[PDB]
Amino acid sequence: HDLKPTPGSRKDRKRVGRGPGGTDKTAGRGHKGQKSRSGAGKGAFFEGGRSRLIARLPKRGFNNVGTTYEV
Amino acid sequence: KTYIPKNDEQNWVVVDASGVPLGRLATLIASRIRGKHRPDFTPNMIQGDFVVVINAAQVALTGKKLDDKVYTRYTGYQGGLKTETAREALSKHPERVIEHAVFGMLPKGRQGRAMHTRLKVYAGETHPHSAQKPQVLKTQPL
Amino acid sequence: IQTGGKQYRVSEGDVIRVESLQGEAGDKVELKALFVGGEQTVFGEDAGKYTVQAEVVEHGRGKKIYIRKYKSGVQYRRRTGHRQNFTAIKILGI
Amino acid sequence: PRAKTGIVRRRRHKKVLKRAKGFWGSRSKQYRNAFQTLLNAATYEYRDRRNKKRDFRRLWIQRINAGARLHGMNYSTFINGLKRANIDLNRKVLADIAAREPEAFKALVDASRNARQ
Amino acid sequence: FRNKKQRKQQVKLRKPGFAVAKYVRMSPRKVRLVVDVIRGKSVQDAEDLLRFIPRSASEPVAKVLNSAKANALHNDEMLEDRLFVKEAYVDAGPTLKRLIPRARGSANIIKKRTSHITIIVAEKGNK
Amino acid sequence: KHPVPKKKTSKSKRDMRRSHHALTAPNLTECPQCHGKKLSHHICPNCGYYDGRQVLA
RNA sequence: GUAGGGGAGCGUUCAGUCCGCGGAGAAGCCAUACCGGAAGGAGUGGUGGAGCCGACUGAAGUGCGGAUGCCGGCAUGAGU
RNA sequence: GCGAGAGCUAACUUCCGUAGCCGAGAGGGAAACAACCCAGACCAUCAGCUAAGGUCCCUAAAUGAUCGCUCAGUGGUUAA
RNA sequence: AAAGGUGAAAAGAACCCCGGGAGGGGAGUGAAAGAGAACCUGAAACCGUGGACUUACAAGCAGUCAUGGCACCUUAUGCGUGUUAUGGCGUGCCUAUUGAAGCAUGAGCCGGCGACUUAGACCUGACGUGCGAGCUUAAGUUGAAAAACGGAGGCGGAGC
Ligand SMILES: [Mg+2]
Ligand SMILES: [Mg+2]
Ligand SMILES: [Mg+2]
Ligand SMILES: [Mg+2]
Ligand SMILES: [Mg+2]
Ligand SMILES: [Mg+2]
Ligand SMILES: [Mg+2]
Ligand SMILES: [Mg+2]
Ligand SMILES: [Mg+2]
Ligand SMILES: [Mg+2]
Ligand SMILES: [Mg+2]
Ligand SMILES: [Mg+2]
Ligand SMILES: [Mg+2]
Ligand SMILES: [Mg+2]
Ligand SMILES: [Mg+2]
Ligand SMILES: [Mg+2]
Ligand SMILES: [Mg+2]
Ligand SMILES: [Mg+2]
Ligand SMILES: [Mg+2]
Ligand SMILES: [Mg+2]
Ligand SMILES: [Mg+2]
Ligand SMILES: [Mg+2]
Ligand SMILES: [Mg+2]
Ligand SMILES: [Mg+2]
Ligand SMILES: [Mg+2]
Ligand SMILES: [Mg+2]
Ligand SMILES: [Mg+2]
Ligand SMILES: [Mg+2]
Ligand SMILES: [Mg+2]
Ligand SMILES: [Mg+2]
Ligand SMILES: [Mg+2]
Ligand SMILES: [Mg+2]
């Protein structure tokens, strides 16, 4: 029981909600939005509705493995 | 801290309204009633003096007003909003003009209402309060 | 008879709390008058010469008060505590 | 491990209900109306602190105005001739002089007027 | 004394002039209505007034006034010809809930209030 | 149709309503014979005495 | 000062550990004008009848006025 | 408010531009009044000077001073 | 579906009292019946009895703040506490909004339950730590009121 933890080596988490202190309401989320919603999937490469840079671009070459040399 | 007094006295006067504009005598008396001339003045006490008005019959109203000056007394009843010229009310019952005036110039809460009573209104030069020995107040702006 | 803002009015011999004057249990503080605490009456520079003395009496954390604020519709509610530090002073007027 | 409110809520609540007394109907007895009543009460406390600072000032003023006028002076003229002869009195005190101390107010008057002309 | 426990040991509670109609099948407010006339009156008076009050709760109320007078004279050695109604009141019992059908499908919780009627008799003298 | 009350009523008014429901006390007298207590203009219930006897003891 | 990011902390339980209390009375509950910058926390008095406070550290089902929220109790409407 | 367009040199109108304000702004004023005029509230004070705006009574403060106007209650709502 | 608790032990209340009873008031047992079988604590809404101060010319988001009255004196005779009269002042809360007292949403009241979490030996960051051109194990094995072993693989090492 003697001991103690390194200053700054354990940060107490965030429990969002709970008071006006505090993170009132909303929970970081603001007012409405698709973001507002308890639901998975959005995701991360989903820009706009749209068509992505990702698929707007030239697929060059292919994929060979090969012998790779150890430095 | 600041000095809250105690209401002894009960002090009386005689405003002679003979030949004075209504509004003016109206505020002179309204003020003597409210109390504001009492340096020990106090806002939740009705310190003010008692005012006896004589000759409310012979008040001065500046023309043409008494032929223009309406008084509107609504009655609850449709076609109620009845009228009255200042000369009408004056020949009828003049203390109800003076009363009416002074009463717009006093607070409209529990107090003010109660203060009304500190007004004694007559006409000619006669009052029945000779027992109250009223101090003949004047007409100035001081 | 003023003292950190507030004027005062003393007769002779009494308490009066003011604010954080310096020293501890029984210094000896003195102030220049604006007005005669009684007889004959004199005022101003004609009465600065006439002064008063007054010995300290105590150091003080006064009676509690809270500072609460509110604005509707925002969730703006603020709650703080406060005590104003005063010094107690015994009047010994010249 | 689970941790019921157990106790805390009753605590918070009572706190409010003990602030909450003298209050007319439900206000003094149901939590929600109580705490609520107190939100507004908050507003009124804050403002009315500075406010009373105004109101008293008003009171002192009307008493002095009176005083002045009791001889022949205006408030404004008295107080101005009491700025002129530099008689740097608080006005709270001036009220005090005015209503509890007669002949003193008399002198302060004669002074202000002198310095005025 | 010292301990609460010691006081418990020593004293015991005696109830002077008191009796209790427990669990009586009548609504509080009704029964109060009778009882408001008993209170503070020459205890025999109460026996008479309670013969000519025409409400239903006259009788359980009177029953409890004889009990009190009884308990007051016997168990407490008091003075009949100076005994009176020091206290009287009633509060709620466990109210007795049953269903009534109504128009169409709806139903209803109808509550048969009970009453704890209670009188305290006493000695009334002026000096 | 179907008028209901707008707001729940207070303990205060409600008990100002009840302000009259207060029972009036039988104004009684003692009955010259058997000696219980009779209602004025009725039969003293114990004996049966209105001036001689009627309903019986 | 709204959404928002940042900073320091108050309380709840379970847990490791120490200080330690308790039938001359634990927790819980009830009253109050004390203390802390605030979450809060102490003093004493009445309740109760067998358990518990405090410090440091760890882990959370960890703080409710709202959701026409859920369970339960009791009010209004009504002596209608 | 100033710039323009669509409108009917209509709108608590709409679509741009531009400054400030409310939004997210309490305080005084404009009777009342998100936007307007003054002004950006770290606590305490029964302390003092000012801003816009005011100073017969309600309601703090000149029923002020001098040179005038209108007599119509204009003031206290419009035009050829 | 909701359902739990007398006491240490039934020693479970002979017996007298009002009542048909129910219920209670004694007694007697017990440490306690401030445990008596509607039997541990007994919060709050909610209903009542008594008492203080108040209230029948008054206009109100029910508060605030100032003063007077009356009352009380166990953190308590002063910055008092309870209550009150008179004054000034003052548009419930939440959510939703360009803008809410809103005649816009929600809700009878009080309890109690009620919502930003967990997993992966994934990703990327901030704080910290241990070794540091080096850093590290996983499955498992053995022991296990403890942990140690386990290089198989992982990350760094050079880009284009
Ligand atoms: Mg945060
Ligand atoms: Mg929302
Ligand atoms: Mg949106
Ligand atoms: Mg508001
Ligand atoms: Mg100021
Ligand atoms: Mg014994
Ligand atoms: Mg059917
Ligand atoms: Mg522990
Ligand atoms: Mg525990
Ligand atoms: Mg709820
Ligand atoms: Mg509804
Ligand atoms: Mg009826
Ligand atoms: Mg009806
Ligand atoms: Mg009917
Ligand atoms: Mg639009
Ligand atoms: Mg917005
Ligand atoms: Mg503003
Ligand atoms: Mg404004
Ligand atoms: Mg205003
Ligand atoms: Mg507007
Ligand atoms: Mg100016
Ligand atoms: Mg004035
Ligand atoms: Mg029995
Ligand atoms: Mg009462
Ligand atoms: Mg009247
Ligand atoms: Mg009255
Ligand atoms: Mg909310
Ligand atoms: Mg809208
Ligand atoms: Mg409404
Ligand atoms: Mg609504
Ligand atoms: Mg909607
Ligand atoms: Mg690192």
From Swiss-Prot, chain A:
Phylogenetic lineage: Bacteria, Thermotogati, Deinococcota, Deinococci, Deinococcales
Protein's name in the database: Large ribosomal subunit protein uL15
Family as reported in the entry's similarity comment: Belongs to the universal ribosomal protein uL15 family.
Ranges for region Disordered: 1-45
Subunit structure and binding partners: Part of the 50S ribosomal subunit. Contacts proteins L4, L21 and L35.
Protein source organism: Deinococcus radiodurans (strain ATCC 13939 / DSM 20539 / JCM 16871 / CCUG 27074 / LMG 4051 / NBRC 15346 / NCIMB 9279 / VKM B-1422 / R1)
Domain of life: Bacteria
Chain's role: Binds to the 23S rRNA.
Cystine crosslinks: none
From Swiss-Prot, chain B:
Any one GO CC term of the record: ribosome
Keyword S-adenosyl-L-methionine: no
BP-aspect Gene Ontology terms: negative regulation of translation; translation
Keywords, alphabetical: Ribonucleoprotein, Ribosomal protein, RNA-binding, rRNA-binding
Disordered: annotated segments: 124-142
Function: This protein is one of the early assembly proteins of the 50S ribosomal subunit. Binds to the 23S rRNA.
Protein name according to UniProt: Large ribosomal subunit protein uL13
UniProtKB/Swiss-Prot annotation, chain D:
Residues passing through the membrane, by range: none
Example GO biological process: translation
Keywords: Ribonucleoprotein, Ribosomal protein, RNA-binding, rRNA-binding
Any one GO MF annotation of this record: rRNA binding
Alphabetical list of InterPro entries matching this protein: Ribosomal_bL20, RIBOSOMAL_L20_CS, Ribosomal_protein_bL20_C
Highest taxon of source: Bacteria
One term under GO cellular component: cytosolic large ribosomal subunit
Function: Binds directly to 23S rRNA, probably serving to organize its structure.
Family statement drawn from the similarity comment of this UniProt entry: Belongs to the bacterial ribosomal protein bL20 family.
Protein name: Large ribosomal subunit protein bL20
UniProtKB/Swiss-Prot annotation, chain F:
GO terms for biological process, alphabetical: translation
GO annotations of cellular component type: large ribosomal subunit
Transmembrane segments: none
Region of interest (Disordered), ranges: 1-32
InterPro entries named in the record: Ribosomal_bL32, Ribosomal_bL32_bact, Ribosomal_zn-bd
Requisite cofactors: Zn(2+)
Segments forming a coiled coil: none
Ranges of compositional bias, category Basic residues: 1-21
Residues in C4-type zinc fingers: 31-47
Keywords, in A-Z order: Metal-binding, Ribonucleoprotein, Ribosomal protein, RNA-binding, rRNA-binding, Zinc, Zinc-finger
Top-level taxon of origin: Bacteria
CC cofactor note: Binds 1 zinc ion per subunit.
Keyword Nucleotide-binding attributed: no
Sequence positions that bind Zn(2+): C31, C34, C44, C47
Record-level Gene Ontology MF annotations: rRNA binding; structural constituent of ribosome; zinc ion binding
Function field: Forms a cluster with L17 and L22, and with L22, a pair of 'tweezers' that hold together all the domains of the 23S rRNA. Interacts with the antibiotic troleandomycin which blocks the peptide exit tunnel.
Record text on subunit structure and interactions: Part of the 50S ribosomal subunit. Contacts proteins L17 and L22.
Similarity field: Belongs to the bacterial ribosomal protein bL32 family.
Name this protein carries in UniProt: Large ribosomal subunit protein bL32
Species annotation: Deinococcus radiodurans (strain ATCC 13939 / DSM 20539 / JCM 16871 / CCUG 27074 / LMG 4051 / NBRC 15346 / NCIMB 9279 / VKM B-1422 / R1)
